Design a protein around this ligand. Structure first.
Ligand SMILES: Cc1ccc(C(=O)Nc2ccc(S(=O)(=O)O)c3cccc(S(=O)(=O)O)c23)cc1NC(=O)c1cccc([N+](=O)[O-])c1
Ligand SMILES: [Mg+2]
Length: 477
């Protein structure tokens, strides 16, 4: 750890080991025809992107790192924070079934084998996986990490920075180029965090309908119940935060982590891992590993739950600050849904929206109105039209459900995933059945008319069910 200075506003701690940022996309066009105006396309691919002449990917990454050197917003008032945290912990103790510890074997099995091991080998995890265990280098890395876990010994996570290959609005390619920062965790940290927090994460997933952290929900199976519950409350809103992860305070995440640790079956071992996760983070940006003291270190498996929990603490602190009602009463009078930064907030309380917005902003968060104008967040008295997990919530005669917007459905027709390549507009030879049947489902939820337009598009080239049938399957079966 010898070099020094400042990289993208953040301290340099060492030289970096990360491989080069990706110059390819997994998205291919489904026909050679020209795309409509305003059509979304895969994010910028760097100096070799034929579509535009933009900055280096490393510069694009430096842009994403800016928010992490911004100053934090403020802690909620301490007396409110303490009471909110207690009420959250208490609700979780009243609902979660105690779990057994996770074994090394279980931890290994849980890892997604089709992503990278991160530092130091940067290889797809499948490559040292036998079907039942890690061998070779990953085996060594995993076993060592597991030993350290069992001994309650600290290890420093090393995260690897990347940029997300996804379809984006054209202006993010042909205007001011943007591309989203991803933190990839090192396999050692994944093994330790899996063993320590997999149990809590499982317990919490079993309650995803009765508790606000919805991670693990099935939209088609649980959405109807989840949204029917929200609708029992009068006022509905969604703060639609900007840059949620980069604006988090580690002090808040430490509060969320404390709760996770105390509700874990190996709390002394889990405490060591959570402290490592929340200590100033080492992020490999290629040239340098830099130190990031603030924001969400979003590599590991449990981080969505941790982030969700931090979301819960802040939303509730803001509501208590403004309404001056006790946390437990706010919770009696509300239904929340959280998935990382994504929220739905339903309440019977008459919130002073201007005062609510100001408190969120005082905490360093960046809530945004639907019109992106300045001023206070808005609320409505129907759940319908609020979104969660990229679906509009819709109510009808049969009940509530989540519907994918037409535009997202169109997009999945224009593009298909396949191996990585350099030119997005290239069509993939050689035809995705189950994915077609799913698309018909979503199309169906928009009526027979739109369903039929999508149904023709699907027939090419390529068992096309009737609207009424498929609707019934997706809504009820
Ligand atoms: C965030 C997100 C973004 C894109 C997709 C998604 O469906 N992507 C795609 C999958 C498969 C294909 S395929 O090539 O035809 O097989 C896609 C093809 C084109 C475009 C997409 S995409 O929507 O633009 O990514 C595809 C899914 C998600 N994930 C969710 O909607 C999601 C996340 C967590 C939980 C739930 N959920 O419980 O409903 C749903
Ligand atoms: Mg939302």
């Amino acid at each position: 750890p010898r070099p020094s200075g400042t990289y993208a506003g953040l301290p340099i701690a060492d030289y970096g080991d990360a491989p080069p940022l990706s110059t390819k996309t997994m998205f291919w066009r489904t026909s050679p025809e020209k795309l409509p105006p305003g059509a979304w396309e895969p994010a910028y691919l760097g100096s070799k992107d034929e579509r535009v002449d933009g900055p280096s990917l490393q510069q694009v990454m430096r842009d994403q790192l800016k928010p992490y050197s911004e100053p934090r917003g403020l802690l909620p008032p301490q007396e409110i924070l303490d009471a909110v945290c207690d009420a959250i912990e208490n609700r979780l103790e009243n609902t979660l079934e105690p779990q057994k510890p996770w074994t090394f074997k279980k931890a290994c099995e849980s890892l997604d084998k089709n992503t990278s091991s991160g530092y130091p080998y940067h290889k797809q995890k499948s490559k040292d996986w036998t079907g039942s265990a890690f061998i070779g280098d990953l085996g060594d890395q995993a076993t060592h990490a597991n030993n350290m876990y069992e001994m309650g010994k600290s290890m420093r996570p090393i995260y690897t920075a990347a940029l997300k290959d996804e379809l984006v609005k054209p202006d993010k390619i042909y205007g001011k180029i943007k591309k989203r920062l991803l933190w990839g965790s090192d396999l050692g940290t994944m093994i330790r965090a899996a063993r320590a927090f997999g149990p809590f994460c499982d317990a919490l997933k079993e309650t995803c309908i009765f508790n606000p952290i919805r991670v693990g929900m099935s939209m088609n199976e649980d959405g109807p119940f989840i949204f029917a519950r929200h609708a029992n409350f009068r006022y509905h809103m969604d703060a639609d935060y900007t840059r949620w992860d980069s604006t988090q305070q580690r002090a808040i995440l430490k509060r969320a982590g404390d709760i996770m640790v105390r509700l874990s079956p190996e709390p002394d071992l889990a405490r060591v891992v959570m402290d490592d996760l929340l200590a100033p983070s080492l992020l490999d940006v290629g040239d340098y590993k830099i130190v990031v003291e603030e924001g969400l270190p979003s590599g590991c498996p449990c981080t969505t739950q941790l982030n969700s929990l931090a979301h819960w603490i802040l939303t509730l602190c803001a509501m208590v600050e403004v309404t001056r009602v006790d946390p437990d009463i706010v919770m009696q009078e509300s239904e929340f849904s959280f998935y990382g930064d994504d929220e739905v907030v339903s309440t019977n309380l008459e919130l002073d929206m201007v005062k609510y917005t100001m408190a969120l902003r005082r905490y360093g968060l960046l809530p945004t109105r639907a019109d992106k104008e300045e001023g206070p967040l808005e609320r409505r008295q129907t759940l319908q039209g609020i979104s969660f997990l990229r679906r509009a919530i819709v109510g009808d005669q049969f009940g509530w459900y989540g519907r994918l917007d037409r535009a997202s459905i169109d997009r999945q027709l224009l593009w298909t995933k396949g191996p990585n390549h350099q030119n997005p507009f290239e069509t993939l030879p050689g035809h995705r059945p189950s994915q077609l049947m799913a698309l018909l489902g979503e199309a169906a939820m928009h009526g027979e008319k739109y369903y039929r337009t999508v149904a023709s598009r699907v027939s090419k080239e390529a068992v096309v069910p009737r609207h009424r049938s498929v609707l019934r399957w997706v809504r009820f079966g």
